[PDB]
Each structure stands twice: as structure tokens, then as C-alpha cells.
RNA sequence: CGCGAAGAACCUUACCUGGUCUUGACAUCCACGGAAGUUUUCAGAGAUGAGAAUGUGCCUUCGGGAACCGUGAGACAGGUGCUGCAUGGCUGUCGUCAGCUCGUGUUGUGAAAUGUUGGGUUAAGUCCCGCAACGAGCGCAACCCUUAUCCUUUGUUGCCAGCGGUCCGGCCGGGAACUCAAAGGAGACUGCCAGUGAUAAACUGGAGGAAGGUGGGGAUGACGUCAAGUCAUCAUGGCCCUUACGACCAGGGCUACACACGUGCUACAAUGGCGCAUACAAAGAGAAGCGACCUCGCGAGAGCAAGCGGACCUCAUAAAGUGCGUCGUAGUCCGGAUUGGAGUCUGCAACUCGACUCCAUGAAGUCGGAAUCGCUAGUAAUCGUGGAUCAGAAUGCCACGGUG
């Protein structure tokens, strides 16, 4: 989909990251970036993403790598 | 349309010359080039520190009489309905209703 | 039944235009804008001077605007103080200097404009519309008019249900592409609703 | 050298008017001109609706039409220059000049 | 049709054999405009009646236009066309001058 | 000595020039048969010289621009009828026998308002 | 019911959740403080809470005015909230159906009738007779625009017959003939002939003519009917909210899914599918734009880089068709859905929800019930092209030609 000229994500996000990482892993970070790409220094850490009225967390694995963030977050309950 | 609404599309114009018309266009081309800066350019990154507001995608060209943002024509800058107005009172020059 | 606009169709065949400047795809669309402002704030500023027909024309450089009124001295005013306080100001609007131009309506009861806007002066003043319509008719017949006929509806006297009445007199084609038809309309903005007024004149053949 | 004058407008029996008056000038000081040449109307169409709700089919047809005159001066001569170049013209003919 | 009483149109005859019957023929099978494409079709089907089902490929045309019968001819010449489509053999050309055979020998 | 006569249609324009002697046809300097794709179109042209009889006689140099396929074989039938009154002047009345100076001047109906072509209207629903 | 919406990834957007603001997002009036603006800076999803650098234009009977920022007080601003059973304007519809009325005279106690009941003839209340009606007006028609023939004027960026020049390109001298380009004009008016018809209007037939019986097409839609549609284009009476029915921002929704209905596209194929070769359009668009040539990639494209505000340059090689070869009547070399994988481009940003390309997968479907629609000629059918909307996003819509 996207080209191949950098892979996109969020400046906020990315510095959410990089004091994750140093610090250690924390309470699930809410956040609203369902369009940032899965970077491999996130796997391990819980990241609850926002669907338009709550925040889901998800456990990042090793495959989720590439995906997006709003690809875990269903937005919209059915019945 | 209603008057914040048209004072929404007065502050993306604003923002637009401010600083999407020459420092987003040089982010452009960096992003671009080939030859030089082909993994480490970083210019995406400080792109997005920029306010959305500035963008031209975000602006909505509508009516410069009411302010509609439907029936839009860039020949006259108004609403489809406007421009019937002004034509029949002679003010739009050279517009008549036609036949072929 | 549905009537197309008379003055819109005949233009170019019988009818000059209202603006006659010419501009390329560059600043035609910039200065149809500058149009608007300009038609808005000489129709507000003389209100009660009787205007009714504003004729605009852009030279290379330069523009000016020809005003049609039947009482140019409020327009011109004491040696030319209210031409000069209009003239400044035109020119901050269309950017380019500016130039205001008189031209004296001999007869206001022939434009239909002018008749129009003492129908939509009088519906405020209470005067009745059986008056108001028959006073027009036969001061444009008695000044060399071959046919007349106006139309008011909604709410007439302050009626609940909207109403519809013309009174006719002399001879007006409308589908007749040779006819001198002078038409525009007028709004009455009374305290109990709006009331449309529609003129048409007719003027003779080609 | 070579001098010619692009004349265009919106109205036909106007632009060929102020033709004229730069023809025959030319011709009267003693220009060579070899006529002005009718180059085609770029004629624009304009289809949009006349009501602001359903009964979509109302619509109204409009155009705009862009005539174009040509005119080509052979020789630049002192007398036609100045005497073609503060012309007084219609308001609604626009001049282009190319030197 | 009502108040309205005119003739019908006169087309042109057809420019290989300069018969204007068989210019009305062509036209049946044509379809989206494709006169290029009906009239090699037509004429190869003809051929075929000609060359291998009996000689005359004007009056070979006539004997299986009557058993089938300006209307008359009309009539005739669309149920020729609209039985040839539905047939078991491979190109148009082929159904069509069976079809002509058959009703040449009126089965 | 050169007889020139215009003949047209929707779209085309055709040009045609005699000169005396030859069966010549040069059409935007090819031949009748690499032009033409089409055996009818080679043929309407030949159909204005039926009743005046050519085998050997006159040269044609013609060209032609738009149109399509019979667009240009209706122009060039035309511009051939108005050559030979031009050559000969006694043969208009085999010509207006045939008809082929007529100009068929029917041409594409304009697309209308509230309708997707000339006639056809959108589907129709009855209540 | 491909309607408003000519185009919902954000914006649009009026909705929801959540975070926020209260003379307010925005306008007019006064005072004070800052020239405005420029440049950057740290937290926040953002709205913004705090700093560095810089100018100080303009006249200053030195009060400073004036733009814009900041603060504060109130007058006021704001609402796509209510009502198209309080309204204007506009539109659909019967219907481009031929009707709808006045003035005077006349008839009847009268409301009214006649005209405008009848005899013909026309697209037509079109026209002519008849007639206590005679006339006129609103409609129809005509005048307008476009196209179909010819002439005049004018030959560049357009044109190439007679010529010279060949690197075979109107390309270069030239030619002004012709095509084309557009300013004006001629030409069709039942004008002429014959027959029918009450010697009328009119019809039929024929000649002339490019066009003949309103030539072809458009514009042009009467009085009225449906309290038809529009308080969400706008205008507007009244009512309602106001530290909220307002305003800002983030994300989501408008695109959901057990179903129903209307409107379209592509199909079910040999009048076809595919491969190669190859011929012919018209009409538009283009400067924050169209973007050639060259080079690379299977391709979507990318790089390099002219020309062009344009009869010059670019989009732009029109497609059907034609010629050959192939498949041989089948769920197929039909048809392309759906899905996976790998990518291009647009844009802060393509998950929800974009377009396109490449590989692979190959649903239903083998001509469709009752019912129902369009159309009388360059029409139907079909083939492609272009434009508006638009950063991007057309099976919709508006135009344009090809075949017919
Ligand atoms: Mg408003
Ligand atoms: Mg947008
Ligand atoms: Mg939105
Ligand atoms: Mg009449
Ligand atoms: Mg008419
Ligand atoms: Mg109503
Ligand atoms: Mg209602
Ligand atoms: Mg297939
Ligand atoms: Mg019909």
C-alpha cells in the first residue's frame, strides 16, 4: 500500500517508545495512533489503542511487525 | 454555510502560505531525492511536527458569496445557484444561457 | 407554470450586458469577487439616491463603473464630495485605481428597477397593493411606454395565505426575442414576511 | 523586426470594431499589414443545476464565448508605433504585444 | 401512425451483387453497427450455398426465400437469421447456409 | 486543366482534383485498395461513376480528413458528383437522377439535459 | 430512491465519544499594553501554558493616530435548532397539450351566453368560409442561435494545387488556389407548374434547388393544478438556547449487516476470446498546471528534462474495424467475482475506508417468471474520447465523435 520510501509513524508515539524501552515496560500506554507502523523495538510492550470511545490494550507480538495499530481495534460493537 | 465554518477555512488559508507553501515544499523534494540522503533524510519526521491545518487537502474550496461548499466552480469561485443570480442581472460578463 | 428569466435570456441578442469587461483564466475569478463588493456597497450607501443599474467595465490598468440613477445629486453631491469619497475606496477594493462614472435615468418609471423598489417602499409605508401597482402602470403609460405589467405575491396586507395578483396594461411579448424587456426584482421586507415584486416593461421591438 | 497585436473578446460585433481602428491606422502611415486573421473561438460550456433540491433534470445551459483577432505589422516604423500604442479602445478588448 | 401516414425508408441496394433484397438481409443480422463484420459473414455463407449446395447464388437465395414467406419479405428473411443463431455448428457462416439449404428443400 | 469540386459529411472534408487520362486513384498518397480496409467503401465511390462511364479516362488526386470509415467514402462520392458538373455542366440531369449531389446533412443529435443520450431515457418506473 | 451531495481516508461534517473554551471560533465600539510581522523554543492526541532574536513604516501645535497582537468591561456576536400549514424567490407536473381572456356590440329579468357552438383544413384557438358578432391580447408560430449550399473580407501557429528543393518531414523558398479558421451577406417564400378542393384555406404530385412543404437540432413551457420540493443555497416574520442548541481539537461514524426495494456496470461468448501487424475521429483541458524527448522497470510508474498561458507545445498511440494465425461449442484460452502475496502513486497520514499495477486463485452465471421501460433515423444499439467535481478518489453525470 504505503511506498517504500520510510515506513510512517507518529512523532509522539515514537517517543512513547524510546522511554519504554529505557525504563522499562509500565502500564498499558493510551494513545491514538492507529496509523503507525510496528516497529521490532515495541514487541513486549502493552499499547492500548483508542476506538473511538475506549482504549484497547494489545500484548505486541513478533509477527505484528509491518501491521498497524488500528488493525487490533475494532471500532464499532455488532450484535 | 454557517460563519465559523467559513472562519475555519479563512485560518487553513492563512496557515497554508505560512508554512506549507515554501518549507513543506522543500521537505517535498528532500524526501525525493535520489542521489543524496537515501536512507537518513528525516525530512517525513519533521514534517510531522508541522500543524495540520496547512495542508491543501484539508481545505474545501466553496462559495465566496454565502459560503456553500457544493457545486463549486473554479471559473467563477461561487455556488451554482450564485452564479445564476449574477448572470441574470448582467453581472457575470458575457454569460448567457446558450443553445446548441 | 414556471417562466424563465426575460432580461437573462435576451442578453447579447436585444439586451447589452451589465458588465462587459474581459479578463483571461487568470484574475477572472478574483475580480468577478471584486464585482460583488462593489455592486453590494454602492447599492447600500445609496439606497436612497435610486439606483438601478451598475455598469462595470475594467480597462488594461484601470476600472470604471458607470452608475444608472434617476437623482444624480445625491450622488454627485456638493461639487463632487460624495463622487470623491466613493472613488477611494472602489479602488482599495479591485486593488486596481478606479474611476466613478454618472449616468442621469431620465424617466425611473421605465426602469424596472426603480418601479420595483417604490412598490417594495410603499408595501412598508401601508400603502395598499391594488394602489401601489395601478400608480406605476400609468405613469410609465402616460411617459411613452407600449406595455406594462407587474406582479406581487405572498401575503398581501398581512393576509395568512400567500396570494397571487398581476394587473396588465398595453402590450408585453415575452416570447417574442425582438421585445425590449426591462426586468429585475425586488424583495418588500415588511414586519410580516417578504413580498416578491416582479416588473416587466416593454420598451418596442428590435 | 515584426510587431503583432492579439485582440481578444467576448463580444464579436465589439472586437472587430476596435480592429478596425488599428488596421486602418496602420494602413493610413504606411505600415505593411498583411490583414487581420479570424483565429478560432475557444467557446466554453457551462451545465449547472437551477434547483437547490430534487427535480434534478431543470438545468440551465451556459457558455462563454472567447473570440481571438490577429493582426501582424511587417515593418516598425516611428509613426505606426506611436501612433498604435496609446490607442483609445474598448474596455472589454484586452492587448497583447509581442516586440 | 395515428395521423401520421408515411412510407418506409429506402436503403441502399447491395454494392456487391446490386440486389436490394439482400441489402435488407444483411442489416438483420447486424448488430452494434457492425456492417463490416455482417455483410463478410453473409457473403461467405452464400458462397458456401453457391459453390457446394447448387449454382445461381441470386435464385439459389429466392427458392429458400419462398417457402419460408414487402412485409412478406421482411418476415421471411428475420426467422432465416434468428433459427440460424440457435443451431449445434461452429460459425455463423456455416449455420446460416445450412439453413438456406434447408429451406431450399422446405424442411 | 484541373476540375475541383467539395464534397463532405459529419465530420469529413474531401478535396478532388481531375485530371484528363488515366485510372489513377491516389488517396493522401496511397492507393484505392491500401486506404480503403473496407470492399463497400471501395465501391460508393465507384457508384457516382456508374451512369458516366470511366475505365481509363481521368485521374483523381484526392485527400481527406475526420470522420471515419463511411464518413470519408460519403465525402469523396460528393466531391465527385460536383467535378463532373464542373467538367462536363450536362450531366446534372443523370445526377439529380441519382441523387449523389444531395448533401446528406444529417447530423449527430446533441446529448440532452435529464437524459443519458439524444432519446434514451433513464428506466422508467410506473408507480 | 447514481436525489440535494459536481465526488465522507483527515478536512468536508451538520453526528458520536473524549479532551477543552466562556464578550467567546468570528464582526462592530472604547481604554490600556504591545508596531504588525519575522524567526525559533519545552510539555500535550491536539487546543496552546511559558522564553529567545528583531524591526519602531507614518505624520507627530509629542495628544499619537492607523493597521494587527495581547488584556478587560459591557452593548452584543454565534445556532445547518423549531416551522415550505407564517413567506419570498426558484423548480417539477399535466404539457410545447392548445388552450386561456379582454374591449365594444348583441341575446337573456339574471348569474351569463355569443365571439371562442358549425363546415373544412393543419403540429397547433393553424388558416379560410359560414355566422350577431366585429376586433384585440396572453399562448402557438415567427424573429434569435447552431447546422446544411454559395459569395465577400483575412491568410498565422492553419492550408499545399501549379511550381523550384530534397536528408522524403509542408520541411524551405514560395503559392492565396483549395480544406479549415470567423466577420458580414445571398439563398426556401407553396415562390412556380399540374390535379383535388365551394373560385377559399389547405392537400397531392412534379420541376428547379445544397436544402420543399414548420429542411435538421436547440433556446423558447400560457391561465392554472398538486398547501408538490426547498427555514440545510440564500433571503425572511416569529419562537427557542446562550460558561450552551455555541465554539476548539483528537479519534470514530456517515462505507455497519440477518434482509427488502429502486437505479447502473460487466457477463453468460465464436456477430466471440487471445496474439501480432495496422487505418480513420470530433470536442475540450493546461501554469502551485499539461508535462514531450531520452533512460530504467513485466507493469502501475520513476529519473532526467524541453516546449507551452497556447490553431505552435503537452495530455494524445481514439476504440470498434481491417489482415493473418489460434482456440472448435465446453462452465471453455467464455466470464471475471472473491481472496492471498508482492508493489506504484496521491496526501500530515491510505487499518477502519482510496486509486492502480503485477503474480496466483477462478464464485454465481450457459440469455433470465409474473411484471415492466426506452425508442420512428443519423434515432435505437454499440465503440471509445473529453470535461465539471477533485491533493487523490467515476460502473454516476455532463458533452463529443466513430460505425449504424
Ligand atoms: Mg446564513
Ligand atoms: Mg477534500
Ligand atoms: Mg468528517
Ligand atoms: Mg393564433
Ligand atoms: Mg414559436
Ligand atoms: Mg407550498
Ligand atoms: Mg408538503
Ligand atoms: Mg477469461
Ligand atoms: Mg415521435
Redesign the interface.
Known amino acids: 500500500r504505503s511506498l517504500k520510501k520510510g515506513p510512517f509513524i507518529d512523532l509522539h508515539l515514537l517517543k512513547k517508545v524510546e522511554k519504554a524501552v529505557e525504563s522499562g515496560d509500565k502500564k498499558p500506554l493510551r494513545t491514538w495512533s492507529r496509523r503507525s507502523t510496528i516497529f521490532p523495538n515495541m514487541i513486549g510492550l502493552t499499547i492500548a489503542v483508542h476506538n473511538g470511545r475506549q482504549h484497547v490494550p494489545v500484548f505486541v507480538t513478533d509477527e505484528m511487525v509491518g501491521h498497524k495499530l488500528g488493525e487490533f481495534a475494532p471500532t464499532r460493537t455488532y450484535r | 454555510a454557517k460563519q465559523s465554518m467559513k472562519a475555519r477555512e479563512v485560518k487553513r488559508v492563512a496557515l497554508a502560505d505560512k508554512y506549507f507553501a515554501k518549507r513543506a515544499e522543500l521537505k517535498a523534494i528532500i524526501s525525493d531525492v535520489n542521489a543524496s540522503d537515501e536512507d537518513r533524510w528525516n525530512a517525513v519526521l519533521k514534517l510531522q511536527t508541522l500543524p495540520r491545518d496547512s495542508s491543501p487537502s484539508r481545505q474545501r474550496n466553496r462559495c465566496r458569496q454565502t459560503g456553500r461548499p457544493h457545486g463549486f466552480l473554479r471559473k467563477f469561485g461561487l455556488s451554482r445557484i450564485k452564479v445564476r443570480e449574477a448572470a441574470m442581472r448582467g453581472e457575470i460578463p458575457g454569460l448567457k444561457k446558450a443553445s446548441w | 407554470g414556471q417562466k424563465v428569466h426575460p432580461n437573462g435570456i435576451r442578453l447579447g441578442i436585444v439586451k447589452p450586458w451589465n458588465s462587459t469587461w474581459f479578463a483571461n483564466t487568470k484574475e477572472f475569478a478574483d475580480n468577478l469577487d471584486s464585482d460583488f463588493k462593489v455592486r453590494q456597497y454602492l447599492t447600500k450607501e445609496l439606497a436612497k439616491a435610486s439606483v438601478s443599474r451598475i455598469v462595470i467595465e475594467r480597462p488594461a490598468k484601470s476600472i470604471r463603473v458607470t452608475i444608472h440613477t434617476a437623482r444624480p445629486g445625491i450622488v454627485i453631491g456638493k461639487k463632487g464630495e460624495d463622487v470623491e469619497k466613493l472613488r477611494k475606496v472602489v479602488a482599495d477594493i479591485a486593488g486596481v485605481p478606479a474611476q466613478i462614472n454618472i449616468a442621469e435615468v431620465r424617466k425611473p418609471e421605465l426602469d424596472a428597477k426603480l418601479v420595483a423598489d417604490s412598490i417594495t417602499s410603499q408595501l412598508e409605508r401601508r400603502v395598499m397593493f391594488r394602489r401601489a401597482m395601478k400608480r406605476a402602470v400609468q405613469n410609465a403609460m402616460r411617459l411613452g411606454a407600449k406595455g406594462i405589467k407587474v406582479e406581487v405575491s405572498g401575503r398581501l396586507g398581512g393576509a395568512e395565505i400567500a396570494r397571487t395578483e398581476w394587473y396588465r396594461e398595453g402590450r408585453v411579448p415575452l416570447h417574442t426575442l425582438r421585445a425590449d424587456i426591462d426586468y429585475n426584482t425586488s424583495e418588500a421586507h415588511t414586519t410580516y414576511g417578504v413580498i416578491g415584486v416582479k416588473v416587466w416593461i416593454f420598451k418596442g421591438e428590435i | 523586426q515584426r510587431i503583432r497585436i492579439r485582440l481578444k473578446a467576448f463580444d464579436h460585433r465589439l472586437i472587430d470594431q476596435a480592429t478596425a481602428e488599428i488596421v486602418e491606422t496602420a494602413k493610413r502611415t504606411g505600415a505593411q499589414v498583411r490583414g487581420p486573421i479570424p483565429l478560432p473561438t475557444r467557446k466554453e460550456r457551462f451545465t449547472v443545476l437551477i434547483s437547490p433540491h430534487v427535480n434534478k433534470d431543470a438545468r440551465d445551459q451556459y457558455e462563454i464565448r472567447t473570440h481571438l483577432r490577429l493582426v501582424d505589422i511587417v515593418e516598425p516604423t516611428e509613426k505606426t508605433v506611436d501612433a498604435l500604442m496609446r490607442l483609445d479602445l474598448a474596455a472589454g478588448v484586452d492587448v497583447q504585444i509581442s516586440l | 401512425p395515428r395521423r401520421r401516414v408515411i412510407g418506409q425508408r429506402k436503403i441502399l441496394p447491395d454494392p456487391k451483387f446490386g440486389s436490394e433484397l439482400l441489402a435488407k438481409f444483411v442489416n438483420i443480422l447486424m448488430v452494434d453497427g457492425k456492417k463490416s463484420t455482417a455483410e463478410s459473414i453473409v457473403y461467405s455463407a452464400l458462397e458456401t450455398l453457391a459453390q457446394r449446395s447448387g449454382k445461381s447464388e441470386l435464385e439459389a437465395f429466392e427458392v429458400a426465400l419462398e417457402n419460408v414467406r414487402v412485409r412478406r419479405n421482411a418476415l421471411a428473411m428475420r426467422w432465416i437469421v434468428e433459427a440460424a443463431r440457435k443451431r449445434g455448428d461452429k460459425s455463423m457462416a456455416l449455420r446460416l447456409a445450412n439453413e438456406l439449404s434447408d429451406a431450399a428443400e422446405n424442411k | 486543366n484541373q476540375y475541383y469540386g467539395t464534397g463532405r459529411r459529419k465530420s469529413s472534408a474531401a478535396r478532388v482534383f481531375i485530371k484528363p487520362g488515366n485510372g489513377k486513384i491516389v488517396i493522401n498518397q496511397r492507393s484505392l485498395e491500401q486506404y480503403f480496409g473496407?470492399?463497400?467503401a471501395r465501391?460508393?465511390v465507384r457508384?457516382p461513376l456508374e451512369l458516366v462511364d470511366m475505365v481509363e479516362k481521368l485521374d483523381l488526386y484526392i485527400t481527406v480528413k475526420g470522420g471515419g470509415?463511411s464518413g470519408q467514402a460519403g465525402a469523396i462520392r460528393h466531391g465527385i458528383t460536383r467535378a463532373l458538373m464542373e467538367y462536363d455542366e450536362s450531366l446534372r440531369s443523370e445526377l439529380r437522377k441519382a441523387g449523389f449531389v444531395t448533401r446528406d446533412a444529417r447530423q449527430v443529435e446533441?446529448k440532452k439535459?435529464?437524459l443519458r443520450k439524444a432519446r434514451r431515457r433513464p428506466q422508467f418506473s410506473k408507480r
Open positions: 473496407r470492399e463497400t465501391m460508393v457508384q470509415i446533441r439535459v435529464g
